[PDB]
Amino acid sequence: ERVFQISFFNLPTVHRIRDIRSEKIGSLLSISGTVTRTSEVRPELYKASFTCDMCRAIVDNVEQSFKYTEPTFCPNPSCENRAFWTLNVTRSRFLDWQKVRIQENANEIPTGSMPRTLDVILRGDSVERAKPGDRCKFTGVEIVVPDKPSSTLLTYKISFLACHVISIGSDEINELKEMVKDEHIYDKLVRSIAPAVFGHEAVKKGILLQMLGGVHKSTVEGIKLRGDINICVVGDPSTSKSQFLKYVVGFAPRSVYTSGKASSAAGLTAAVVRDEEGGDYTIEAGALMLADNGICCIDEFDKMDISDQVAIHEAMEQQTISIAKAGIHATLNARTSILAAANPVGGRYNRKLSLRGNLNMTAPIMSRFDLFFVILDDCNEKIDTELASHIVDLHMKRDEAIEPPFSAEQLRRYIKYARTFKPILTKEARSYLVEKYKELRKDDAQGFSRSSYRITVRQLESMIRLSEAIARANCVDEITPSFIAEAYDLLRQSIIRVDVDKYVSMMNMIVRKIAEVDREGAEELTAVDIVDWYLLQKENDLGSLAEYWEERRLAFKVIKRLV
Amino acid sequence: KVSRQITDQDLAKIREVAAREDLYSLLARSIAPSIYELEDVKKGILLQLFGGTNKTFTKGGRYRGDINILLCGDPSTSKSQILQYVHKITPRGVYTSGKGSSAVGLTAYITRDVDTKQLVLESGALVLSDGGVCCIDEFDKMSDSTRSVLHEVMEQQTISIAKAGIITTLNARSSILASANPIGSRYNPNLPVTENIDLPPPLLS
Amino acid sequence: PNVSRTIARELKSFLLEYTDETGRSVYGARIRTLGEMNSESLEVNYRHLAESKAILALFLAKCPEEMLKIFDLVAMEATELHYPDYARIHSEIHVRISDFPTIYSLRELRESNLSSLVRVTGVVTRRTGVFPQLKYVKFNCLLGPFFQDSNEEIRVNGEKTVYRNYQRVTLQEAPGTVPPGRLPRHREVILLADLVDVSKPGEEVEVTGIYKNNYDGNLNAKNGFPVFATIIEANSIKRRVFSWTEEEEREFRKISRDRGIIDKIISSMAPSIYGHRDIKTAVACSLFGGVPKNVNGKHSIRGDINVLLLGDPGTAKSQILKYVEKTAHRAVFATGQGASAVGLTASVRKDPITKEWTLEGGALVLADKGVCLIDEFDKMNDQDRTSIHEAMEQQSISISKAGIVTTLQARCSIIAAANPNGGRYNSTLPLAQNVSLTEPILSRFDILCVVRDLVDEEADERLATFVVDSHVRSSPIPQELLMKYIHYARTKIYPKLHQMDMDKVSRVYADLRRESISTGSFPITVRHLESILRIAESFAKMRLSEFVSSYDLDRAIKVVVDSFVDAQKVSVRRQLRRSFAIY
DNA sequence: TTTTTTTTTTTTTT
Ligand SMILES: Nc1ncnc2c1ncn2[C@@H]1O[C@H](COP(=O)(O)OP(=O)(O)NP(=O)(O)O)[C@@H](O)[C@H]1O
Hints:
This is part of a larger assembly, with chains A, B and C. By secondary structure, chain A is of the alpha+beta class. Chain A has 3 domains: 14-42 and 96-147 and 155-169, CATH 2.40.50.140; 43-95, no CATH class; 170-500, 3-Layer(aba) Sandwich (Rossmann fold). In chain A, 26% of the residues lie in helices and 7% in strands. In chain A, the strands form 5 sheets. Chain A has a 4-stranded mixed β-sheet with strand order 1-2-3-7, with no helix packed on it. Chain A has a two-stranded antiparallel sheet with strand order 4-8. Chain B has helices spanning 12-19, 23-31, 39-49, 79-89, 125-129, 150-153, 193-196, 201-204; strands spanning 68-71, 133-137, 158-161, 168-171, 175-179. A 3-stranded parallel β-sheet of chain B has the order 1-5-2, covered by helices on one side. In chain B, α2 (23-31) crosses α3 (39-49). The longest helix of chain B has 11 residues, at 39-49. In chain B, 27% of the residues are buried. Chain C is α/β, with parallel strands linked by helices. The longest helix of chain C has 19 residues, at 64-82. Chain C has helices at 3-15, 26-36, 46-52, 64-82, 246-256, 261-268, 277-287, 317-321, 323-327, 363-366, 388-394, 439-442, 457-470, 479-490, 499-502, 504-513, 526-543, 550-565, 572-579, and strands at 120-127, 131-133, 164-172, 186-192, 204-207, 210-212, 231-233, 237-239, 306-310, 331-333, 347-350, 357-360, 371-374, 413-418, 447-449. Chain C is 32% helix and 12% strand. In chain C, strands 1, 2, 3, 4, 5, 6, 7 and 8 form an 8-stranded mixed β-sheet that branches. Chain C folds into 3 domains: 1-102, mini-chromosome maintenance (MCM) complex, chain A, domain 1 (2-Layer Sandwich), CATH 3.30.1640.10; 103-134 and 163-240, no CATH class; 241-583, Rossmann fold (3-Layer(aba) Sandwich). Chains in contact: A-B, A-C. Chains A and C meet through β5, β10, β11, α6 and α9 of A and α13 and α19 of C. The structure holds phosphoaminophosphonic acid-adenylate ester. Chain C binds one DNA strand through β11. It is classed as replication.
């Protein structure tokens, strides 16, 4: 019950595939490069029991040669085989193995080249540890393989093996206790995130809060609720919002990022690739695959158009995406935040634009990403000199020595710690979140062309999924009224960034005409003019000629009611 | 053998050329011996091969030295001559036309090895340019999937290939010069500039 | 060893007279079951083996292979005491062996897992038909009888040889459960006897069987080294499992006796949802299916329900559809288009090398007797949408490609979810102004589900207090029960109306259509009328009345009413006052 | 005692 496997590492020097020569045979060597086509693992004979050999020799050992046949060699005595082996499989101990062909890396290879590459076989428990696309340190063992010479009583080639492979190519919570003491690490975690960006404030938070997880769980029975969080940041190009995005990929784990129109469609969707060839239906990932459980990023929704808009929105509700070309029936685990930034369809604000018509996209995918968090970037003279101050300090190669209060990597390990929390407010002061959410829609109630949306029933779930991450921020669980208050108002800005029964229609517009106009003007002149712009917007949503006339004689009848 | 380690004594011949006053003009006039006037072009293109410096920070950064430059004017300016020239001087050069460019065209064709029957990742015209200088014709005339590899490397300064068997998002960093023409091809006197440059001013930003 | 005969002596004890949950051995009940079911497939709980002796259970980790060989041979005996027969019936039964974790997935497998019992699971993929295996060699004499083979038979004969089923099945791990970056490495799995052909292409399933390798095998030149290929033969198979039994069902009818069970299943269908009791009615209504039903030897009409759910942003809509999957025994989730696998075309592809064209079923084929679910009709091309309109008419699919005349059978009910043109509420004008989809494909659907709204105050305090109460986890029928429920009734109960009280719906349909002229058109058809009975028959199946009571209609009718009524524009102010008598 | 095989038709797809 013992078979021991040797591995040697930290080898003298990395050698190229172009460096591969016959001298290296039977010798240790370090090489690294990209995977191609990992093949399924199938056992190594090592030793076998095969016998008899005519008729039972039961001889069990060795036969470890590379064929691997056969036993039956020089048995028993007296069995005199020759004969059958006969193969005895059960006593044979097996191990591993899979063939993985490595490709030579692009950065080193001298274009035009077309890198010439051979197989790395994984013999040893070091098998399977590899992942496609990565470069990895290997152990040499040049040797050779059978399919120019022939053994007269053949053809050979390079077979690369490694007895050892690495994928290259504690007390810091005591740092974290020190960090989880302060009140101030809440604002600290904020000014410490992206130095490459200046100002923009609240939006920063969400980014963090995006890397931070939500509940993304329960409550049965039934569907998994969200969970997650989502942000589409917008503003006039030159905004320097993209500086956020490279910060996503340049900070966050397993970050997938593409802005392009061309994915294409599938894309985050599967292709499906046909012909493979040979029976085909080969299912592309595509795109978002390793993106699963990660922060996905896009630019310029104008430049992904409308075709795929809701097809990447499958994961924005179901959180998983099935994919149909008339391929084979499938569904895919997508669970991810999707953050992005389109440039506004006017290129600017478009103050007046309700953000709904601001985006050039549909509420199902729009209402779902919460929340957008508008930033318009403008000139201001001081600010022109402050952009000429700090943005300059970024322009600066030096001083680039200005630093955040948090070392970036310690912020990451703080997250990897903050990713452990599963904070839950069961607390009865979530009653306050009701009133809040109630008063969240009491205002958006009119106009329905306002921030509404509604705002969406999902924005209650969103209201929750905000304080989910607020908790990981403050590291305590069960949250609080203050915590959600943060997030609620925090929505409230970017919903305000969207801002710029006979007599129930009459007392509607009696105080509504003044609601849109008595703040922006006098609410004066005559009584019947208030009727005349109303014969404009009344006729279009009324459902008869009779419902037109009670939009007439009632706009008469309430006038002589209040006159 | 064929159809560069620097010697020491011409290095102080370099600094000798450095004390020479007109090296900013001089080398430029040595850039394009074929072309008359347009000295701001030789000027710029001089500074193109000297373009920028690497900022690696602690992390992120990598704004590089990379500089794109557009040029255009009256049709056939001898722009294609400076492209066809500078293209050849370069350690890694790149050149193509408008309408001869698209998204699918310049990155990772990932074709089969053919004769050995094995799919092997191929570098597209953009991966090889990584470092050095690209060149193209008439950005007004580029297709819609064209610019989709551009929106991709201008800032990302990388390229993302996850498809088929193997996944790599690999870097591309190089300065670039595309020749072009106004829509006219005369851009006509007066007029607002943006439309006259074709394209929206957001894309030109 | 012969000492294992003594093992065989005790396992019999665990195998037959063992009892669980206050007597009533699962054994005697199943033996008796088939038995009466004579399906010669016996199923064994590992729940029990661990509890009693964990030494027989570790025997599954050494060599389960032959352990079962005598094991089932005892069950036979144990079954024989119960049924002194089967000498004339099958004369052999092998046990199924329910779940034994393990709980390994796919790609992680080691040679240490060979010859020892292993549970596996994954999604069904391209499969062969059934070829009978040879088993025991036997002839007229004529050398003698030989065993064979799993599978060698080395190192010529036979006549009366006892044949058995054999089917080889390539199964691949779910693209959904696929770890990222990876290609779908896959496994070959053998099926025998009752286990044969049970599984069906494209579904998640459990394969219980042990691993085989041997031998060389044939790869060789692709390796250069000894490699014994991966094959796994399943001692049993279970889909991603549930079926009713005698006791559950006998209690289950005791639910069916009470008046308001129909009412109960209403509040049960949206357990975490709340939302509107309005729609769920039509949801479990559709979900319950209906009588086929044939008029000899002609058209079978339709017993299957066509759901159209109009959408609205932020409405529960996309959340409700997916309840039906883990609800339904059988379903296919297609989303809308863009799309979700598959695009619902039934295609035909020529197989590798030299073979003529194999026919791949449209996901509907996967969904037969079940229900197909779609959302977001704004996102469907006019290309893949065509064939939708087909299935709900013929209850089948007929495609184009290429070289083979065929027909199929599609019994799929259909749940339509689609977001309104543009944003929230679209036609203050007639709702015909709402849908982008053509009316021919619209009226095809029997239940027109409208959702809302422009904000109301109190109802959201209602739903959302309920919501912040829902998320707190981190009258409804128990959910195990209601799936067992609708399914139980869908394999059995077959409702019929009597013409006596049902002329009333000819006259009252006259009432439901004469002024369906009064405002707009249509979205009625004569199919629309046809569907009403299909709505009632379902509730009858929930009441398990076996034939339609008058009230069973009142359900259906009342549904149809406001299914049409708020679907009408504000002019529906009048349309209310007419359909009153249809209350 | 084993030998030896890539176009043409159609398809589903951005
Ligand atoms: N009773 C309820 N009413 C409304 N929303 C609910 C209810 N219960 C839960 N929700 C939540 O509200 C969300 C709204 O989902 P839904 O409106 O269907 O997304 P969607 O608008 O359909 N996206 P799309 O299908 O593209 O239009 C659900 O996913 C739940 O998280």
